[model samples]
Target: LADLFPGFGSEWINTSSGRIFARVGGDGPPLLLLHGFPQTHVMWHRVAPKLAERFKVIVADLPGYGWSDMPESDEQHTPYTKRAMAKQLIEAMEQLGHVHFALAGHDRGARVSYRLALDSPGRLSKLAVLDILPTYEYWQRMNRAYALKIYHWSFLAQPAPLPENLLGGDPDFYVKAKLASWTRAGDLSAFDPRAVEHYRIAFADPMRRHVMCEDYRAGAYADFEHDKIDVEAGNKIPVPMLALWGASGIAQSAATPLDVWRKWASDVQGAPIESGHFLPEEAPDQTAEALVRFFSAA
Candidate 1:
């Protein structure tokens, strides 16, 4: 993985949750990149180098994924909630000497990015969410097609050991199948096999598998409530927000991705990338270009 990101420095920083593994490089305004489900910071390998050219890039593994620690979860799955995850990420950033920075996140990371913007107002200069609608919106719009597309939400959120046991049975197949189905090519052509192996190795661990489930459990319960409370209270993300979804991604299933985002963010703008769910890997050039344009604006 180190060779994948030449000239970047890797560091492990301790937070309330646990130690977070991050790669830091470049020199300019701070820009944090967060990866999605079944992937690590390596997901940004192709995109980060380009973004780093214009801004200081910090790509970190979300807790319980990649090299990050898996904090214990409770009945509410608070440890894995986006709110908690965001809080810990804030601490990690502060430790790296960035009190304020720009952020771009995909999949599960996007959930945490929005939560951070909402929970700690002014902490982010700009926000970019890739290929995902807000969790609240997803739950509100769950239908047959959407549900079938992302059945992992309900399947992974199931109480304990069930998901862990089944996934552990054939972790490689499960991960490969997901990567294949979610990409535009309907195969693994878009992904680097090395990166895919990284995902497979981490997911093969029963504990991490359990933690991944806890992440979804939190999404279903705690994270959902948090979004609801904000909705009911009329809270919205005040920072400039860019939402880029795959033309054939899960978010495209929504009535209108930007409209759904506008309801949660005051200033939202974006378009569809010509790819599937994994925009960064599937379309790194376009993904990086969109991010540079969005975060570069003053």
Candidate 2:
């Protein structure tokens, strides 16, 4: 595991589908950095190494999201659910001898960490859900702003597959649209055009479309089951918790900030960065500094 980090860089690991790009290096305690959508594990390019200096950092693409195999699938192979997806990742971590570890994820990955905390309270040492909230909470409390924030959920989660149709029409165009809309105001050129092309080309397979839909659909339907289990177990992350987000972007109003996290996390605390929606990309230095301080604090 120690040899998996630098110099040797990342290697392909075998999953049910096939080999995938993954890396594990650095030292100290274990920390998993989960990236958000429209991008792969590379999203944590800045933040991961900062914690890695004093902690073991593990980063991977969620099964259908990044360089991981986009297995051929029909209706039966849909993986739109973050809970089920988190389980797959947990298995990967356990395989790496990580009996337990700290977790921090952005965007969709943040949602996955929420489920991870609720589903395996005793397993994770800490949880840092960045720049986003629980899917069910946001969906349940859908307002004009909420709808505005996540406009694509309804469009993509539709049954009978309009999402597949639209994406299949031009996958690159669709993927580019997804990445562009992530920030409030920005030009597409702000992101690596080559990386943007990789994300675009990855979804060229139609099964990926269905899988992405499953992610959103699970948010709407399957989250209730996990919420019930969490409530019954009095689920609160047993370790120190950090809730970093963008004040200028997502959680603009600080009046009732962190309220939702307290419902599940026993010791939750955080502040919003004065950056854009995507921290690692928009503000790499600021994001890394905040994470290092939060993870290193007493």
Candidate 3:
């Protein structure tokens, strides 16, 4: 898996939660890249090297998703919540000597990035969220069509051992099918075979699979409450935000990504990338260009 990230230094840093795996390389203003659910940091393999040319890139595995440690989760699923994940990630970055940096996240990672920005002000210089609206938006707009498109949200979030056993029965198939279905191409053509294998290996582990379910479990309860509280409080992300969605991806199903984000963020801008849900894999060049332009802007 490290081979996919050439010229990058790999490290497993200790956080209060547990050890986190990350690949560090390049030079310039520090930039942190976070991966989404059912995937790992390897999702950024195609895009990171390009962004590395202009920024000191740090690609990290969200805990329990890759080489990172799987910490215990309480009944509240606190350990798996985005706020907990964000706190640990901030600690990891602080250990890496970046007290503040630009951030970009895909999927679940995007959720963590926004939570971090909202929970701890002044930690992020800029935020780029790919293919997601706020969690509140998703739950609020779970129409029949929207729910059908993202059935996994409810499925994975189901009470323990159910989703775990079902997905664990054939983790490889589930991962492959998910990666293919979420893409605009409706195939695995967008992903590197090695990257696909990495996802499969992680998902195949029962503990990892369980932790992933806990992630969604947290999303349904803890994460949703967090977002709802913020919404009711009229709290918004204070940093500049870029909301990139796949032209035909899941985020668009609810509403315009920017329109949804504007309600949650103070400074927001974005456009549809010419790819599906997995932008870095499906459209690396365009994704990298969009990130560079946004993060580089003065």
Candidate 4:
């Protein structure tokens, strides 16, 4: 795992809220890289070093998902809410001497990036989201098929210990299942064997499993409400935004991935790649190139 992020410096950025586990490398414009669920900062392992060449890449694990702390959540799941998570990242960045930066995230991380863009518009110069739309948009448009496909969102969001207990029986299997099932080929062949093991290591803990459940719980309730309020109040991200999605996975079904982004972003651009939900692993080169081009654009 250390081999993946060459030249990167690892540290625990302690903040009033909690400790943030992050690995940073390279130099230039600061770039914050966030990862999705069933995984950790390792999700950026394939691309971070490359991006680091032209930018200072700060890859941080979402609280509770990696080497980070899992603060207690509530019935509203505030601790796991993207808003709270975003605040943690913001403080983490501030502590690291980066008050402004470019942002890229996959899945849950992307959700937080969106919230940051909405809540703190000027903090980022550019934003990139891989393989997902806004959380509220997805939930509002969800149908039977979509819900069945991503059923865990609701299952995990259900009150405490329910999904936690169900998944506790074989958490490792559940982790691999999510990773494989979300990919195009429905196998772990796409992921590095070591990275897969790393995911298992982080998720095997019962508390981590429950915190992950709270992440989704907040997503379904608090996050959804916040996003709706922003959308209703005519809030739109002022920064240049890029949305990249897998052409073969869940996002492809959307009539307009870019359009959905445009609705929430005044300046948005993106397209579909011939991959699955795991954009970084499935098309690392394409993903890296698209981000570089977009982030570098005048």
Candidate 5:
């Protein structure tokens, strides 16, 4: 793991939520970084070491995604819900002695970051969400274009063991396809070959894939409802937020990323990252710079 993470030290920490696998490095203020699906904490390899120069960066694999344990997935898929995942991250941060810290998340990680900001504002100093909209916003106005662009939301959210069985048959193809399709030119040329392998290794585990499917299952069902109730009650992210996305990616396919996020947060600001869904890999320099600037600002 250290060979893969380079400068970052590795560890497995137990939290009330579940055991979390993380790459811990850096020495300034704590900044919790989260990775998206089909990927691991290694996703931040290119940018993390740089961010480490001025911040204590904790890059963690969401439970069930990497070396992390695949905890039980309840009937409602609630355990894998962003709400549940958010608590786990919070416990991890607290255990690391970072009761409050800056936060930045990419894709699914971003979803958890924003949800954490909403549920536990005091625990987060600032926030940055990359390549995603609030879960509620996506389902509320889903369209054919949106559906075609992000079909996995539906495919993986189907009743478990179905997606698990189908995807498990050829997990490598499924993961590689997602990585390529979400990139600028539909190529895996942007990711480190080793990082690609790490993702494939995890996805190949039927249990891991089943748990990941449960993640989306929760997203489509429980997570959406949670965001809906909050949005309906006029709940908004209490901290400053930066919403970044690929210049020509699926996230930008929506009308405008800023307008959508402003609906859920009081303070929002950001622009294009000049890459695709996997911003840290595709545009590491810009992604790192954006994070440093946003999380560092007053």
Candidate 6:
């Protein structure tokens, strides 16, 4: 079958970094949309088209997840930190001939957005991080309940093979069950069937499962290291920044998070879109509206 968008199909490209998985659509300034854990480019299934009305959308599976290649490669034994992944994306985009553009990330993608803002500045015109606290602060303020809600955050960030072994043993069931677990039961109808299946396939393999672990496990070492640097530098993400969250989701106190966000970014503003943690799926209308206005204004 032909691509729905001409010259826009899922193509695998190799770089010094590794092969990257992405789908290109529309014809305007590129706005890269990065997905969070347990999902891939597919997460933007709905959100992309809405924004595509005005901007080109590049939705990527990211390394070690979804359709993307997941060989340990040079990052072997190292924490699959957001900084490393963010750098990989930066180079991957450059390899794709995009020097600068806007970026919107959800879940883990938001984590990388921060790293990109800290590590590479002014390259991104508008940066929006969905539902997250600074990695270091997430750990610094960790309590029993806060820690418990995000149990996988600590578990996956552990050293290597252990987390991989547990998850890889049954990647399908693991990812499928995880989806059911993370999302609110009543919100099930909000998701797209194809999108859910895409995640199943992304986390379908043993190797991808291992990569997921490495990506998650990097928290203690690689992620935190970069996070520490940003905190010390008093990071100021100059781009017009927006942070969106679901009222019933992980982004507690969505209204006040801006106070904390201001610590890292000089210019920041955000609001909550009522839904679940999975923004693209759970709150497509609200997500689309917030993003359309935010992207256009930014």
Report how far off residue 50 is in candidate 2 (Å). 2.6
Q: What's the residue-level lDDT of 207 in candidate 1? A: 88
Overlapping backbone residue pairs in candidate 1 total: 0
TM-scores, one per candidate: 0.98, 0.85, 0.99, 0.97, 0.97, 0.91
lDDT of 5 at 104: 91
Residue range with the least summed lDDT across 10 consecutive positions in model 4 = 247-256
lDDT of 1 by residue, 185-298 (tens): 999999988888888888788888888899999999999999999998999999999999999888988668998899899999988999999999999999999999999987
Residue pairs in clash, model 4: none
Please identify which of the two predictions, 3 or 6, would achieve the higher lDDT against the true structure. Answer: 3
lDDT-based ranking: 3, 1, 4, 5, 6, 2
Write the number of the candidate with greater lDDT, choosing between 1 and 6. 1
Task: Write model 6 residue lDDT over 177-246, tens digit each, in one string.
Answer: 6666656454346667767777787677767777777777676567877788878877677778898877
Q: Higher TM-score: candidate 1 or 2?
A: 1
Better of 1 and 2 by lDDT: 1
Candidate of highest lDDT: 3
Clashes of each: 0, 2, 0, 0, 0, 1
TM-score of 1: 0.98
lDDT by candidate, in order shown: 0.92, 0.68, 0.92, 0.89, 0.87, 0.76
Q: What is candidate 5's lDDT per residue for 242-289, written digit by digit as tens?
A: 999998776788658998888889999988988988999999999999
Q: Compute the lDDT for candidate 2.
A: 0.68
The C-alpha stretches of model 2 lying farther than 4 A from their native spots are 1-8, 14-20, 70-80, 228-234, 251-256
Q: Give lDDT tens digits, candidate 3, residues 124-166.
A: 9999999999888999999899899899999999999899888
Residue 140 of model 2, lDDT score: 56
Q: Which stretches of candidate 3 lie over 4 Å from their true place?
A: none
The window of 10 residues in a row where model 1 has the poorest summed lDDT is: 1-10
